[PDB]
From a paper:
Norovirus capsid displays an icosahedral symmetry that is composed of 180 copies of a single major structural protein, the capsid protein (VP1), which organize into 90 dimers. Each VP1 can be divided into two major domains, the N-terminal shell (S) and the C-terminal protruding (P) domains, linked by a short hinge. The P domain is further divided into P1 and P2 subdomains, forming the leg and the head of the protruding P dimer, respectively. Expression of the S domain alone formed smooth, thin-layer S particles without the protruding structures, while production of P domain in vitro resulted in P dimer, P particle, and small P particle. Functional analyses showed that the P dimer and the P particle, but not the S particle, bind to histo-blood group antigens (HBGAs), the host susceptible factors of noroviruses (see below), indicating that the P domain is the HBGA binding domain.
Author numbering:
A (entry chain B): 227 to 391, 396 to 527
B (entry chain A): 226 to 294, 298 to 391, 395 to 527
Amino acid sequence: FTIPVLKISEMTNSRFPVPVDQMYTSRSEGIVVQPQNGRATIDGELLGTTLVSPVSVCNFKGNLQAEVPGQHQLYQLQLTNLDGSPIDPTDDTPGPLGCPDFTGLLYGVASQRGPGDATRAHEARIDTGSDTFAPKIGQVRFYSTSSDFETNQPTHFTPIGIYIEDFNQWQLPRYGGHLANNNHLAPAVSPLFPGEQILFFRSFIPGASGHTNGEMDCLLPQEFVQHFYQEAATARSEVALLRFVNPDTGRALFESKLHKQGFMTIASSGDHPIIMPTNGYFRFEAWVNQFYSLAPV
Amino acid sequence: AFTIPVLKISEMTNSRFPVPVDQMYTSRSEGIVVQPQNGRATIDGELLGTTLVSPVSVCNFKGNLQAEVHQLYQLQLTNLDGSPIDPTDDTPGPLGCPDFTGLLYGVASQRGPGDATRAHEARIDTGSDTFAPKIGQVRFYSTSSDFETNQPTHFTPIGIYIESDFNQWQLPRYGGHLANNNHLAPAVSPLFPGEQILFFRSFIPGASGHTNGEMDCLLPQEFVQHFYQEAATARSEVALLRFVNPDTGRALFESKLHKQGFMTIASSGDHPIIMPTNGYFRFEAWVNQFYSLAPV
């Protein structure tokens, strides 16, 4: 079994198409950690709405069906899957792969190519928390400060950041609209062993407006998802022991438990970033059980 | 031991622009020098040009909003990973720097003071005289004046703006109009008769005007990452590959993966290489540059 050699700064966030900024740990007090993107067993089984492509999460693609009545510069998208295939509500997923897994005002740019090679693009916002947001059945709407959009022309939404007018990275959206309950969701995760906390790979996504640190925590960097999908090595135990080492010194910095279901934990207490030498990276050490005792920090 | 990751064309990421690969494509490249700087990696694991491993960083910019030169701003670039720009590096420019000339359309965002944020459309003319990323000098025009001076700023790429036109094979002057490029990954071309380079093409978004946004890269970003990661020794100058249909069982065609980091096939003319969706490349054997490939 193996994990690719990568510095924190070479990692890609698996919940938003941007690099990882830092490792971070938390008590996650009063919160259910149940992301749907960046979900993969160390076995190579992708969960939730997780796809392998690292530049597709939070992107949308589909036909510009029409403009909603009354509301201006608010457009209705008829989604296809990001790879072009038609949206299939019968799939055993909460929603289309790469679909945002948080509630908030997603800021981005909607572009079109057509008729012919004619193109146009403008800022756009999609409220993943709005009642009408129903990507599971292909119904998604975006607001734009421009009316320069063609009806029935291929359209794509490129994500950028969050717009604050609120952004809740742990609040799952209703993939099927206000009249449907989510299903097929990757399970929530949490540390079960005393003194441990989940280790997150955090990024500060861009803010388009208002106040926000745009904190976005994912359980595994996208590269680990791709590697597990690719290797499909058998999990010899429920926990793969990793050890963060500093190639510069030869010094190892701390150990972490990579759980079979796809998340890491460390022996730590409180909400704080895990600051380490820039060239540090994780390496597989051995197979242990969930009772393995880790030294703090 | 050499290997290439199992991937469908639709699972591949373009190495010159942060978007998925749309299709394989081949060309005579008539009257054109193929010398991209991004997506450059020897099958040995040696990264060339301005190539980085991160798949979401190419064509992005980061730095301080130094000042206004009307709604034209001067950036004081840092490397994408935060480290200061170092012109002494043996690279043409900072890693991930665009390797084409044109009007790059995107969005410039800021966070600061405190957790205050703001973002607006922005354009960077990688062909403009002032464009000098090798020394950290880059400017962006925005239809908004809502930008803070001396606040961390980031440029997220999106597409091309057509008004100076997009030329995917014209390298920008990384050091500004008063300096010549250097440390450039070498140009590549097919040397064997009847062969042409096999490109991994994507249609990047158009922000305005007419354009198919064709962007051809020599290797999908995943192969760059894999070679960087494996660093397996090249037993010969050419790694023979086969594109197989897992559905059926048999080969569709063969391609030669050159040690320097580019592929060629036996083909003639400019056209897309259309194959069954589940098809993917696999390493077959080590051959020399004289290996004869069957057409198509």
